[PDB]
Amino acid sequence: GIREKIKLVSSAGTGHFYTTTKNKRTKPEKLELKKFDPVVRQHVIYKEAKA
Amino acid sequence: PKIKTVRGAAKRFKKTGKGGFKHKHANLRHILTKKATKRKRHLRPKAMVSKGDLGLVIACLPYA
Amino acid sequence: TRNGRDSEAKRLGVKRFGGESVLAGSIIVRQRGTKFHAGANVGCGRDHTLFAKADGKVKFEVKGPKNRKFISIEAE
Amino acid sequence: GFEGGQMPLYRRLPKFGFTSRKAAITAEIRLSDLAKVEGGVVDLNTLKAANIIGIQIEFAKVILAGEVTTPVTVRGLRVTKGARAAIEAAGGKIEE
RNA sequence: UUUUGUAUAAUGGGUCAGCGACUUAUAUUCUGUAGCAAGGUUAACCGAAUAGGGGAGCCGAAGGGAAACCGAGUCUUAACU
RNA sequence: AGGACCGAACCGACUAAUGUUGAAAAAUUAGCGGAUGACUUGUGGCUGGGGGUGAAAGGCCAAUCAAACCGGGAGAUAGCU
RNA sequence: UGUAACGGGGCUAAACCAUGCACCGAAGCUGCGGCAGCGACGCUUAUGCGUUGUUGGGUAGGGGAGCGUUCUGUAAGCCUG
RNA sequence: GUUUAUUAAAAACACAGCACUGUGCAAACACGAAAGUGGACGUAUACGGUGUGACGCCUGCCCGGUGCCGGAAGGUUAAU
RNA sequence: AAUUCCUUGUCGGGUAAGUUCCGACCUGCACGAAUGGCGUAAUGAUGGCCAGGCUGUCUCCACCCGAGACUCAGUGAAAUUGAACUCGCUGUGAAGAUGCAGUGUACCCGCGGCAAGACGGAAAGACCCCGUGAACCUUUACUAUAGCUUGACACUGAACA
RNA sequence: CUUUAAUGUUUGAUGUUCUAACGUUGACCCGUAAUCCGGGUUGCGGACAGUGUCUGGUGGGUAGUUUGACUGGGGCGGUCUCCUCCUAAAGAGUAACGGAGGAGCACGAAGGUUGGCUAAUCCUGGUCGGACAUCAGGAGGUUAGUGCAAUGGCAUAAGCCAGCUUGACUGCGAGCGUGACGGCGCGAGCAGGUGCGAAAGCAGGUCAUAGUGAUCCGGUGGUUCUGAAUGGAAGGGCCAUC
């Protein structure tokens, strides 16, 4: 409900992604969060993208 | 004539060693972002058909 | 405007009573708030379910200055 | 399968899998089968003649089933760790 | 007969005689029973024809896995307490 | 002269009674309208079933027409009795 | 519609309270005899029989055991002018 | 005049009369996979459709919606 | 008002008395101009109203004449029907009883008559509901389609600008 | 080459003509003592019209079907999923077109952790200031507060700040709860990697309970799977996801 689904993508080469939502209006910039990439088995920066 | 297999059943159940049937869990097809990772984790593995349902499945897979 | 609605009963309540012997993990109470609080060898989950952290016998007690209800588990 | 109108179990739940065309031309051989071939040499050909595997079979694995009481030779067949020991305990030879 | 319930003023039958309704085929499972038994059994056909021949097949003695595959283990998982 | 008047034959069918297991699956009796006209009647022909024909009522199409009749699909289907 | 607001007759208790002891009263209990199911045990086990507890209202329905009809074999047998 | 043969004969249908409107003839329109045919051996003072219903006095306002007639510039637009 | 709900509107006429009829009013619940308005002589087995005559339509029925009905002879059906030794009352009761209870009454059988009951006969209710029944019918419901219409190619060529 | 004309040239567009396809329901001859048909001639039209295949529109003209259930008959009205309280008879559960209400979201902080804090309301005093703003004292004691409905909770705060952060982790999971099933839920603990803290320790979202949609078909990314002679590829499976 106005809250859009986005995917956070692994900054390593893997194509691993977490999925979440965003109020794309009030918080229009790209969400960037450290999370665990299970393919390299290490925590890596993840950066917002479209779904 | 030969009984005809209910084919969508046969595309959803497989018979196991002691005579049961294995099947894939419901609820892991789409609308995923909202579902807890735990719930989806526990739906990945296959499961056994419950007792109440064996009559139905067996009726549908006479050649299993 | 107009009535006619209700929700499913959540089947809450005490699941193992005083003395019942349980293996760890067994839910002892389903509750909304902490009517019973978790005591020794008892855990409290996110919906305030109290559960066993050890094999033993369920033990209800009342402790402390607020006379709160506590559940613990005695080794048997 | 009809359940009164409710979305039935064979629809309720999702489909899975694919069928391997290779599994169907791939067969398993028991140790109890090794003596049943006229000649003490086990190939696909040996086994087909003794009517132990089907004609259209292209691959086979000897499994640890039954026992083996005769030195036997196997060839072009996969052998499980156990089966290899049982054949060899009885003097057999496993050649590719 | 149907029914919560029918002396019911609820249904059917004026009476007799004869006819009148869970069958059959092929599959499939379970029980009983008979054979044989880690085996069991043949189909079409052949035929000296209910014999005998015929073992193409089918079921079973091995499972796990979506599959490759592995195998008394396999899958899961980088790995499993 | 008149889809003119009165009135039999002819054609029709407004009332009433009778009849209603009838004399009759639509009539009888007394009365009633038209009666040279968009009249009436004989023989024979044509129009065929989602089709005909209809001064139109869903009327008529061989005593049952909001889709004729016979045979067929045919043991339609019947969670009803 | 007719006594019709004890079922009736009738009753001053044959009504009401209270006490008491009698008796009637059922397919309930007991008695005599009998059958079956299920047990057990036995005189003695070829599974029957024998003793002996106990059970035996029943719809939908499940289970068991049977009678009897027509037809094949037994049967060129057996009964039958 | 007509009508529901057989529960409705009327205020229903028809009707002359009126209007709208289509039709230039190989007409429109109808029956027909077609050929063929009615229309008509007719030709806009004719033919079809539709609504009104002798006659007398009359028939006002609305084109926004629906329908039809007309339009060619743009926008949108099929096979290709 | 073939239209007016309220409504027997109101007023006037007729009548001894008129929810209708005639005439008016306008407050048209909800007339209105060819899905025609208003009128109209004549016409009509057409609707409403009124009056002369008329009479058994009625007060209120009498008598008579014929055909039946009844008796005798001949022929000789029908619907229906579980079986009947087939009464009344009050009550009971699948809730409206010849059949149960209690009571009252009643000697056996016909014949002519009536229709209160047998929830009398007759047709597996037409109203009402249900069925994931049926059929026609309507439409700016859905999907298709004849038709009508649009254009691309094909049958379909040449020449000059 | 810079430009520019015109002849001469390819295919379109647009015309204007022609005739030889096609039309002729004009006239004529013949088959023929024939208002058919055919062939001939002739005029009239002419690449049009018309027909075939393809295609847009139109199409109740025709056709096949759909058009819900609950319901103190039906219709109208209302209602259909989910959460909370009551009815509910002190475990669970429990009906009604019973009685009240509320959801179909929100938050990258309003999540994690460490450190810290404690409301509401009244009296008295106080510039503008008021019945009520901000300041102070006292009383009070959670009557506050919780992103929101109700109930249950909450000071050890779950209520209010701040710093550092991404555990709103990936793989699993003893053992439980609740369900006809599909499913839903709670869960210590294990592995890997992580945040906060000196540390013991906490963290697998939010005080909990609503905030939702099975299957199929199909999109996107990944992939030691599969790859119809063979190597590839397409399609398929597998993980994620829409």
Ligand SMILES: [Mg+2]
């Ligand atoms: Mg998926």
Ligand SMILES: [Mg+2]
């Ligand atoms: Mg449904």
Ligand SMILES: [Mg+2]
């Ligand atoms: Mg073989």
Ligand SMILES: [Mg+2]
């Ligand atoms: Mg009843």
Ligand SMILES: [Mg+2]
């Ligand atoms: Mg019953």
Ligand SMILES: [Mg+2]
């Ligand atoms: Mg009866």
Ligand SMILES: [Mg+2]
């Ligand atoms: Mg009867």
Ligand SMILES: [Mg+2]
């Ligand atoms: Mg005349």
Ligand SMILES: [Mg+2]
């Ligand atoms: Mg007459």
Ligand SMILES: [Mg+2]
């Ligand atoms: Mg006359």
Ligand SMILES: [Mg+2]
């Ligand atoms: Mg005739």
Ligand SMILES: [Mg+2]
């Ligand atoms: Mg058929």
Ligand SMILES: [Mg+2]
């Ligand atoms: Mg039938």
Ligand SMILES: [Mg+2]
């Ligand atoms: Mg008395």
Ligand SMILES: [Mg+2]
């Ligand atoms: Mg006494």
Ligand SMILES: [Mg+2]
């Ligand atoms: Mg006795």
